Scaffold this motif. Structure first.
Motif, PDB file in Angstrom:
ATOM      1  N   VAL A 188      -6.293  15.486  -2.323  1.00 45.68           N
ATOM      2  CA  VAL A 188      -6.191  15.511  -3.818  1.00 45.68           C
ATOM      3  C   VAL A 188      -5.521  14.123  -3.935  1.00 45.68           C
ATOM      4  O   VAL A 188      -4.434  14.015  -5.077  1.00 45.68           O
ATOM      5  CB  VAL A 188      -4.291  16.496  -3.404  1.00 45.68           C
ATOM      6  N   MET A 189      -5.989  13.607  -3.687  1.00 45.01           N
ATOM      7  CA  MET A 189      -5.466  12.099  -3.570  1.00 45.01           C
ATOM      8  C   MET A 189      -6.883  11.230  -4.644  1.00 45.01           C
ATOM      9  O   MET A 189      -6.370  10.433  -5.238  1.00 45.01           O
ATOM     10  CB  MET A 189      -5.918  10.947  -2.300  1.00 45.01           C
ATOM     11  N   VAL A 190      -7.724  12.321  -4.695  1.00 42.48           N
ATOM     12  CA  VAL A 190      -8.234  11.866  -5.644  1.00 42.48           C
ATOM     13  C   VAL A 190      -8.645  12.650  -6.956  1.00 42.48           C
ATOM     14  O   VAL A 190      -8.914  14.160  -6.960  1.00 42.48           O
ATOM     15  CB  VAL A 190     -10.180  11.359  -5.170  1.00 42.48           C
ATOM     16  N   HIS A 218       0.892  -1.180  -0.355  1.00 49.14           N
ATOM     17  CA  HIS A 218       0.032   0.099   0.091  1.00 49.14           C
ATOM     18  C   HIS A 218       1.331   1.425  -0.163  1.00 49.14           C
ATOM     19  O   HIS A 218       2.436   0.971   0.611  1.00 49.14           O
ATOM     20  CB  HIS A 218      -0.910   0.185   1.229  1.00 49.14           C
ATOM     21  N   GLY A 219       0.184   2.356  -0.041  1.00 48.27           N
ATOM     22  CA  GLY A 219       0.732   3.713  -0.331  1.00 48.27           C
ATOM     23  C   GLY A 219       1.445   4.427   0.910  1.00 48.27           C
ATOM     24  O   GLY A 219       0.696   3.616   2.822  1.00 48.27           O
ATOM     25  N   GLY A 220       1.998   5.892   1.006  1.00 48.13           N
ATOM     26  CA  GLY A 220       1.977   5.933   2.550  1.00 48.13           C
ATOM     27  C   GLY A 220       1.584   6.915   3.238  1.00 48.13           C
ATOM     28  O   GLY A 220       2.603   8.009   3.548  1.00 48.13           O
ATOM     29  N   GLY A 239      -7.288  10.291 -10.345  1.00 47.41           N
ATOM     30  CA  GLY A 239      -6.123  10.496  -9.379  1.00 47.41           C
ATOM     31  C   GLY A 239      -5.701   9.843  -9.040  1.00 47.41           C
ATOM     32  O   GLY A 239      -5.200   7.980  -9.602  1.00 47.41           O
ATOM     33  N   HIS A 240      -4.909   9.988  -7.954  1.00 48.06           N
ATOM     34  CA  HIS A 240      -3.734   9.182  -7.510  1.00 48.06           C
ATOM     35  C   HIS A 240      -4.605   7.975  -6.586  1.00 48.06           C
ATOM     36  O   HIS A 240      -3.946   6.508  -7.165  1.00 48.06           O
ATOM     37  CB  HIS A 240      -2.799   9.701  -6.048  1.00 48.06           C
ATOM     38  N   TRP A 241      -5.546   7.930  -6.358  1.00 46.85           N
ATOM     39  CA  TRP A 241      -5.943   6.191  -6.194  1.00 46.85           C
ATOM     40  C   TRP A 241      -6.394   5.907  -6.813  1.00 46.85           C
ATOM     41  O   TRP A 241      -7.553   5.334  -7.485  1.00 46.85           O
ATOM     42  CB  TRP A 241      -7.486   6.579  -4.722  1.00 46.85           C
ATOM     43  N   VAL A 242      -5.906   5.177  -8.458  1.00 47.13           N
ATOM     44  CA  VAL A 242      -6.228   4.591  -9.493  1.00 47.13           C
ATOM     45  C   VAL A 242      -7.096   3.139  -8.724  1.00 47.13           C
ATOM     46  O   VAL A 242      -8.346   2.674  -9.733  1.00 47.13           O
ATOM     47  CB  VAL A 242      -4.891   3.867 -10.077  1.00 47.13           C
ATOM     48  N   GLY A 255       1.815  -2.425  -6.153  1.00 47.68           N
ATOM     49  CA  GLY A 255       2.670  -1.243  -5.231  1.00 47.68           C
ATOM     50  C   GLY A 255       1.881  -0.438  -5.551  1.00 47.68           C
ATOM     51  O   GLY A 255       2.162   0.418  -7.089  1.00 47.68           O
ATOM     52  N   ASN A 256       1.068   0.232  -4.830  1.00 50.12           N
ATOM     53  CA  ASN A 256       0.845   1.817  -4.662  1.00 50.12           C
ATOM     54  C   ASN A 256       1.841   3.161  -4.937  1.00 50.12           C
ATOM     55  O   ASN A 256       2.154   2.939  -3.462  1.00 50.12           O
ATOM     56  CB  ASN A 256      -0.307   2.300  -4.902  1.00 50.12           C
ATOM     57  N   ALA A 257       2.245   4.396  -5.271  1.00 53.22           N
ATOM     58  CA  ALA A 257       3.194   4.806  -4.421  1.00 53.22           C
ATOM     59  C   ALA A 257       4.043   4.616  -3.615  1.00 53.22           C
ATOM     60  O   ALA A 257       4.821   4.047  -4.543  1.00 53.22           O
ATOM     61  CB  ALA A 257       2.064   6.337  -3.791  1.00 53.22           C
ATOM     62  N   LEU A 258       4.333   4.677  -2.079  1.00 48.27           N
ATOM     63  CA  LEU A 258       5.604   4.553  -1.615  1.00 48.27           C
ATOM     64  C   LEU A 258       5.653   2.645  -1.289  1.00 48.27           C
ATOM     65  O   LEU A 258       6.440   2.459  -2.046  1.00 48.27           O
ATOM     66  CB  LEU A 258       5.478   4.939  -0.354  1.00 48.27           C
TER      67      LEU A 258
HETATM   68  O1  LIG Z   1      -1.776   6.062   0.753  1.00 51.42           O
HETATM   69  C1  LIG Z   1      -2.179   6.630   0.846  1.00 51.42           C
HETATM   70  O2  LIG Z   1      -3.607   7.266   1.203  1.00 51.42           O
HETATM   71  C2  LIG Z   1      -2.012   7.218  -0.512  1.00 51.42           C
HETATM   72  O3  LIG Z   1      -1.458   6.583  -2.041  1.00 51.42           O
HETATM   73  C3  LIG Z   1      -0.184   7.774  -0.362  1.00 51.42           C
HETATM   74  C4  LIG Z   1       0.494   7.674  -1.113  1.00 51.42           C
HETATM   75  C5  LIG Z   1       1.623   9.423  -0.657  1.00 51.42           C
HETATM   76  C6  LIG Z   1       3.034   8.336  -0.760  1.00 51.42           C
HETATM   77  O4  LIG Z   1       3.229   6.862  -0.629  1.00 51.42           O
HETATM   78  C7  LIG Z   1       4.731   9.405  -0.875  1.00 51.42           C
HETATM   79  C8  LIG Z   1       5.161   8.886   0.501  1.00 51.42           C
HETATM   80  C9  LIG Z   1       6.360   9.282   1.145  1.00 51.42           C
HETATM   81  C10 LIG Z   1       6.502  11.096   0.633  1.00 51.42           C
HETATM   82  C11 LIG Z   1       5.518  11.084  -0.949  1.00 51.42           C
HETATM   83  C12 LIG Z   1       4.381  10.538  -0.969  1.00 51.42           C
END
Ligand SMILES: O=C([O-])C(=O)/C=C/CC(=O)c1ccccc1
Length: 283
Positions: free
Chosen positions: A170-172, A37-39, A262-265, A106-109
């Protein structure tokens, strides 16, 4: 499937015992797939993927891992470059679970971690599906930090409901998805002491002595597996220009971009994302 029925814990060694929480489903399916998952603040496997997990579990043996610092995994106050740290934890988990070579989503982080893992333990990563991934992205046009990254930093400094809602918006692409209930739920998780601690440790780890480990766009030309990059056209955290070096240099890359996303595909284009992923992973 429920949070509780799928919940699992493992203790791995990363400079000492490290507890990893994960969710397991589709037991009895032939091919295992690991989801990362993302961060975002309060992000975890279940929050990020619960609904995708149910669909993918029809086809695959799904292991959705809470990355260290998130969900119910240990939240250390100190660690090295985050993706390398998380990839070390994942390697520990693979070994303990007897996994050989497995595809990763994996998404994002979590995309960054999937890639760091595929680079550090090349024999162990199969096909990759990466959604608006960090790490291998480098924003050729967007000034850094992006709007999304700034909003995350601002929350981590000033953990207010208002700041959390600002980040989520800003995630969507469809901001109607950011309901009062979603905000309240994510805030309860994101604003705990352990979580704020973790978030801080994560952002700062990208600027430590091993920062180059985060610059994966320099290394992905070494990836030998097919890699499906998936992006929301309107991603404001890791914008679309971030896809280009990876698309060019990964020999067996593909890219799919969704307009009005947005970010949450995995949320905004749920069905399409699940189908691409299932087809790509060979199910
Ligand atoms: O988990 C979520 O809400 C989502 O996908 C956010 C991701 C942002 C992310 O992974 C991130 C981590 C460190 C720096 C920048 C961005």
């Amino acid at each position: 499937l429920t949070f509780e029925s799928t919940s699992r814990f493992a203790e791995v060694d990363v400079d000492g015992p490290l507890k990893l929480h994960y969710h397991e489903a589709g037991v009895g399916n032939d091919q295992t797939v690991v989801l990362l998952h993302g961060g975002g603040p309060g992000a975890a496997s279940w929050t990020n993927f619960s609904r995708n997990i149910a669909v993918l579990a029809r086809h695959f043996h799904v292991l959705a891992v809470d990355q260290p610092g998130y969900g119910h995994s240990d939240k250390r106050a100190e660690h090295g470059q985050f993706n390398r740290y998380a990839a070390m934890a994942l390697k520990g988990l693979f070994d303990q679970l007897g996994l050989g070579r497995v595809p990763l989503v994996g998404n994002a982080l979590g995309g960054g971690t999937a890639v760091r893992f595929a680079l550090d333990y090349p024999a162990r990563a199969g096909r990759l599906v990466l959604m608006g991934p960090g790490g291998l992205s480098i924003n050729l046009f967007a000034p850094d930090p992006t709007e999304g990254v700034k909003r995350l930093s601002k929350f981590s400094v000033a953990p207010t409901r208002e700041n959390l809602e600002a980040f989520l918006r800003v995630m969507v692409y469809d901001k109607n998805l950011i309901t009062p209930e979603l905000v309240d739920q994510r805030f309860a998780l994101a604003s705990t002491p352990e979580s704020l601690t973790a978030t801080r440790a994560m952002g700062k780890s990208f600027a430590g002595a091993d920062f180059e480990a985060g610059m994966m766009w320099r290394e992905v030309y070494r990836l030998r597996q097919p890699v499906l990059l998936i992006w929301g056209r309107e991603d404001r955290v890791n914008p679309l220009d971030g896809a280009l070096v990876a698309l060019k240099t990964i020999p067996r890359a593909q890219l799919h971009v969704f307009g009005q996303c947005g970010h949450w595909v995995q949320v905004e284009k749920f069905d399409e994302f699940n189908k691409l992923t299932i087809e790509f992973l060979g199910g």
